[PDB]
Subunit: 324 residues, 4 copies
Amino acid sequence: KKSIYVAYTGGTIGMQIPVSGHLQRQLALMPEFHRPEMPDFTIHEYTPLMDSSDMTPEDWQHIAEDIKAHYDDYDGFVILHGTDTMAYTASALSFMLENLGKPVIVTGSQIPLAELRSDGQINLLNALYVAANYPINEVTLFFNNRLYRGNRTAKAHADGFDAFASPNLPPLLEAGIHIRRLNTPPAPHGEGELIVHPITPQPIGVVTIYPGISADVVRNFLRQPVKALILRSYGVGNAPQNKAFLQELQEASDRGIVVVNLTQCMSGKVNMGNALAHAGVIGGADMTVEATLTKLHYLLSQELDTETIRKAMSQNLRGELTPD
Amino acid sequence: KKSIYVAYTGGTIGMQRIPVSGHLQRQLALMPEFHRPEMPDFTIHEYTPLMDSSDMTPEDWQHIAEDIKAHYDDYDGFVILHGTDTMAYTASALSFMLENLGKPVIVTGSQIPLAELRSDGQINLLNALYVAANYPINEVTLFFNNRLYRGNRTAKAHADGFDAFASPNLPPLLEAGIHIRRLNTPPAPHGEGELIVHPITPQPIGVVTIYPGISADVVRNFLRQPVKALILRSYGVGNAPQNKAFLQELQEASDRGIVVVNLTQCMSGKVNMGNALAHAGVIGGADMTVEATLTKLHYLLSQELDTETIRKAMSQNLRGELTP
Amino acid sequence: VPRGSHMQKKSIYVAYTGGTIGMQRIPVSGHLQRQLALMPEFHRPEMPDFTIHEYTPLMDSSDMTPEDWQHIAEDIKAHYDDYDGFVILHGTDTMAYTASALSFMLENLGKPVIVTGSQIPLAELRSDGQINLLNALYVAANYPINEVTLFFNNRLYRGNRTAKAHADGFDAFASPNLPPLLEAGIHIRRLNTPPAPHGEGELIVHPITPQPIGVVTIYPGISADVVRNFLRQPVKALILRSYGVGNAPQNKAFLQELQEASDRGIVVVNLTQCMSGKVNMALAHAGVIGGADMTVEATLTKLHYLLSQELDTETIRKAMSQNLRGELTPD
Amino acid sequence: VPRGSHMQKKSIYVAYTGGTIGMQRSGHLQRQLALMPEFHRPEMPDFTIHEYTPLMDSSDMTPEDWQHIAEDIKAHYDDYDGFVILHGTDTMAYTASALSFMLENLGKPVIVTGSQIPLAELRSDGQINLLNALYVAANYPINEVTLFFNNRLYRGNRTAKAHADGFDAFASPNLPPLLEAGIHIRRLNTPPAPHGEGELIVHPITPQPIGVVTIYPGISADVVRNFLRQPVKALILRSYGVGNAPQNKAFLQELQEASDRGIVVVNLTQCMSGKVNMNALAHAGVIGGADMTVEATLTKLHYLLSQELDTETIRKAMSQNLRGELTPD
Ligand SMILES: NC(=O)C[C@H](N)C(=O)O
Ligand SMILES: NC(=O)C[C@H](N)C(=O)O
Ligand SMILES: NC(=O)C[C@H](N)C(=O)O
Ligand SMILES: NC(=O)C[C@H](N)C(=O)O
């Protein structure tokens, strides 16, 4: 009989506005969760409960350490979380949890378990069952009958039950009458003792490229609050040839700022007149903004020089990008 | 015989392995299919200079709108050949600038140059011409990979695929197969009467993405001077962290007369916002894309309207860009 | 789809015919009803009241016959004036045939009739039974579409346009030639799908009686003899599952066999064996009638409906190509 | 899917069997291609077209035609680097499936393709499907019989024409595509099919009396009884969901009767996707067809019945993955 740890961090799934104790009170009135087929599980309600829209990077740290404390005593882990920033959390955990040897599944609901038509019970029951019977040792996100690689996800449909997507990678598992493991290529996986990397606050900016954007945007970030800049450029990584704009980017990099180029498109791979690259900009391949932002928080929090970080951002560390 | 005007503004479609004047036309001359008796007559106007759409500025939308105006009375339909990177921005801008449109305007292009192997250029162009002449829809539309989309509902969603564009919150208007079929997609508000083409003038607009760890400094920066409007790409149905400092900065922006509009950073979905942001003067952008919102702002800010009037208009369905 | 009033508490009638949803480890009388009594979500104030009529015996939908469609239609008629809507709990295997049959049998339908069920028993782990039934009841009470519909996996489909397309998925059903009528997410949204023909007045049930119908699949190597076989004795109609837009071998032997069949008064209907598409019509000269974009489910039940009426062959042939209940797209 | 070398100029053989692609409103197709510059670019492989006489609408095809095509491939196997079979769309999936079983030790690509609209008509997809097929055959030489359509390469014996009016006419319901084309040609991580070694061997496929029974409400035992009349060495049952049928006593008896007579009865799902999982039917001699398409099952039976195998061996082989047509447990 497997034993699963459930971290109830907050989110829509437990709301009525969140209220302490009602999530558990609800599960108690649902016998399906105590079936002989179901693994044993324990729920830890966080204090305070948070709407995921209020999440800060330090909150990823709290969750990572919570998993670390409970690691040896459980066979799997399920993180109940609000949907708004669930993809950011899943992504962060993938980098912070090195040599993960047990499944960590993040899930939640579009409708609170307290409201009618809720998807909370079904996503939670499935995450528990999957973590116990179809364990994949990576940080994953389960939603609407599919298990996705955490650092490949993004909330793509705000109003649908199929809220999340994995644009550049097929899901890892699908649920129907039976649970099927897909032939999705395993991510680089380290074996050995679990290593949990702590992170510290890091000022990062996210610039979206659009017709009429001026160099002032970049110049502003160069003010004082910035160690990295993420650019959401067009298609496979293009931006206007505006010389003034390019010069600001070059100056940003000369000051040790890590500038990464991503595509603003839902799916696609950046493939960079090689101006941007000449301006010191690093290509982020097919990484999501969610994975790039968290990857930066992770790398910037270590004792790595600017050039090492720039090189690591283009490498596949946890399966967040497709090489060459 | 219908007669179609083709504005060749530039883009991948006519490039070589870099853009070159006359190549596109020289290639089509060697393709008999285009002159078959079943095809409408068409004329190609090559722009000078040809542009990579990534270099497009709002004034370029104006040049195209005025070009359509000049040729309006002499053709039955219009096809705009354009680069894919910002095609959705141009399609969206034209929808607002061309009021009382009584002939079809179809924007299209290709992911691969007509000069390169496996090009989708000839097929997208052939289809746009045939559709404009035989299945006219009096709206600015975008044709790509056998589907015609409402222009101000499109976004480039797949950087590397032939199905590069999507219309996340609205079904296509028409689909091509053995037969061309018009879908039961509800028509957009459509004015009848003489064509009206509204010119636009440069407008400084900022686009801020909400993410864990974002600080009030960013908003404060745009307050510096380079901004008449600010677009927020918020979580899910329009949520953001409730950091008092961040919130106060947004409030000051609105007090200064800056139009702040809230959109979802998700591919699909509708914004629905106590209600902090709303109390901070932020306006809900419903299910509008960033492409439609940015161009709608350029359109409205260019007319002589009070900040009050602009704020109300942004949430109104002017050309079918949002669902009331 | 109309957005009905939620002012008063609705009363929905549930015809529990059997199916996976109420099984366990095999059907057990009373099991489903007890499970629902134990699930709080079904008894909230925002939910309509409902009454369950358990059929005896409960049936695996794979054992259903046209007689069973008749029984269900009569059950609906018997309770029509006493309830605000009807949900038919059914096995998935032939759910689409039942939904299609009811669309033709029920005339002047002024209340919703929604067929639903589940891929996994309401008991068993990971069941989709609770949600499909919960949604069906809620929709029946709040989005009163006056047609026979099928609800599954957050979508409401026009009954006579559906087919079970994915045997192992929770998204078991599809409506290949028509968009869904309604989709459920954080909010319940209606699609502007065009309306089906509607009558007026009290509900009328068009009964059916046994009709021998053959379903021949066209494949490489099939010959005229193969067809002559169906002309054995159990056939008043023949459904042809042809290639693409309605093509079949054009050799004279095969075509003469079809012409002889029609000369004997047999109604021969041409459909596409493809998941989606419309038949476009050779075969026509042989008396074959085009079935446009109808599903085999809709065509089979439409024939049972028409052949059971006192109509001459010519009238039935004409009616088969006409849109009677929204099962096909006219030119 | 292997990313082959582009070092030398490949030579691809094109078997023009007929179909919509070359139709008008003989020689027409070949002249059309000569007039299309794209097909003669230096980045393209050289190709030779063999026009069949007469050309055929794929709806008139029989098993003898699959044999004709197989013999044509064997005849030119050593002289070309790849093979593209131009074919009508209506039965393209049956031909691709048949060839997969017939061609043992296939060490070169064989790609079946065509178009929904004639090359002579405007809006045709013929040019792109053929150009892509030739390019894939020369640069991504997967050693299987595949089907190319609408920017995707599918395993032949896993395909079915699913959309009669769309350009995305074909689907592979139970298996992902092998390749997808966009700005770049991407290969999917699809498990390989069983492969032999040595010179190509063509197994004969001859006409075989096989009945295709669709299970539906009201179907009588007479149907099964009628098939047991003569045109039956095998019977394919298109059953409900994961393989269910009426528990009719007379029905089950006629079935057990068929298997007693040496008839191979295979159970498939009538659904677009899914896997059969039968129990009455099993105890009646019915063999489970897993997740095979009707197209793969029909041709697999033609293949096995045409070989030197007894009934017991054929029944066992039907549930085994011979060429990648089904997923093992
Ligand atoms: N989640 C994502 O990163 C999607 C898309 N690339 C964006 O820039 O928003
Ligand atoms: N084109 C779009 O607006 C998609 C998505 N809402 C974004 O913020 O990028
Ligand atoms: N349900 C259907 O009718 C699908 C498909 N046309 C078939 O012949 O089975
Ligand atoms: N092509 C196929 O086999 C699809 C479906 N299983 C049928 O019975 O037609």
